[PDB]
Design a protein around this ligand. Structure first.
Ligand code: HEM
Ligand SMILES: Cc1[nH+]ccn1C
Length: 291
């Protein structure tokens, strides 16, 4: 497979900035979802799940085809809880019917990170909706109950190296695990709808205890009321991952820079950009615009 980026006909930067502003205005507005966490965290989890199905060996999956819109992908056990993110973006797709699904789902993630005071993420347009039979089968997204070798081997399918994997995982400072969605429960820290390097500081500074939860799954729990998945806790059990965790805990700006590069890479895997294509857009936040 080759998936060539094709700009939505007649659209430029100012068009996409209007879709970004519509998602950001609605994030401000529906601030009550999930006990006042808001929809920012479920929207970056949706952009990572529609992107994380990519396989570098045959170029199948990834964000290009917008195939989460199909039942097979929508009902994947690993996507439980993302229906909420889908339902949020649905009025926005009725308002801007010209944008492709892959472009809207991925732009949802970019807008959430920047509006949660995260780094600016460069974003490219050009994903094209593909037919229901290009939908990847279930089972390509990662399990939580595993160790650092599984994590490393998994992320190699999307060709992510150690630094990219540790930077990407800093997003687990956001939102929370939910028992009915995944069999895990709890938040990762206190500031769960503001983007900071909190995931790393908690992993280095809390007194974590391994316990089983009400679903019979193990997780690491701390005195503070926080939790870590086995795959999260993995990052301080592997010596190469631990040096990077320490780096990001001591330097949030380095974390923001590397998260920005890795998250754009993740959202563009599997897509060829022609060099006539527009350069990546950097969108302004509501605040930058006085809105
Ligand atoms: C080995 C990698 C990963 C595994 C096993 C994993 C697993 C999980 C699980 C079990 C949940 C909880 C779902 C729920 O109950 O609602 C979760 C939540 C979340 N994940 Fe991941 N994750 C991984 C990587 C990532 C990455 C790379 C990102 C983003 C760059 C990400 C972003 C999120 C976010 C923001 C949430 C919170 C969503 C909410 O509050 O509803 N995850 N993850
Ligand atoms: C710490 C954590 N792991 C997954 C989600 N969260 C919040």
């Amino acid at each position: 497979l080759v998936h060539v980026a094709s700009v939505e006909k007649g659209r430029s930067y100012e068009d996409f900035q209007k879709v970004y502003n519509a998602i950001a205005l609605k994030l401000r507005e529906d601030d009550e979802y999930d006990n006042y966490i808001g929809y920012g965290p479920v929207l970056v989890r949706l952009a990572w799940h529609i992107s994380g199905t990519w396989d570098k060996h045959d170029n199948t999956g990834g964000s290009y085809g917008g195939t989460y819109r199909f039942k097979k992908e929508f009902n994947d056990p690993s996507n439980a809880g993302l229906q909420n993110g889908f339902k949020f973006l649905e009025p926005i797709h009725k308002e801007f019917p010209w944008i492709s699904s892959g472009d809207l789902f991925s732009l949802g993630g970019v807008t959430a990170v920047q509006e949660m005071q995260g780094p600016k993420i460069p974003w490219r347009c050009g994903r094209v909706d593909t037919p229901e039979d290009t939908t990847p089968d279930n089972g390509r997204l990662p399990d939580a109950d595993k160790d650092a070798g599984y994590v490393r081997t998994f992320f190699q399918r999307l060709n992510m190296n150690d630094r990219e994997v540790v930077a990407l995982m800093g997003a687990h400072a956001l939102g929370k695990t939910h028992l009915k969605n995944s069999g895990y429960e709890g938040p990762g820290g206190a500031a769960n709808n503001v983007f900071t390097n909190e995931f790393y500081l908690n992993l280095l500074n809390e007194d974590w205890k391994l316990e089983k939860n009400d679903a019979n799954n193990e997780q690491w729990d701390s005195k503070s009321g926080y939790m870590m998945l086995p795959t999260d806790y993995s990052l301080i059990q592997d010596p190469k991952y631990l040096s990077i965790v320490k780096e990001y805990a001591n330097d949030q700006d380095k974390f923001f820079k590397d998260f920005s590069k890795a998250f754009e890479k993740l959202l563009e895997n599997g897509i060829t950009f022609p060099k006539d294509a527009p350069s990546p857009f950097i969108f302004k936040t509501l605040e930058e615009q006085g809105l």
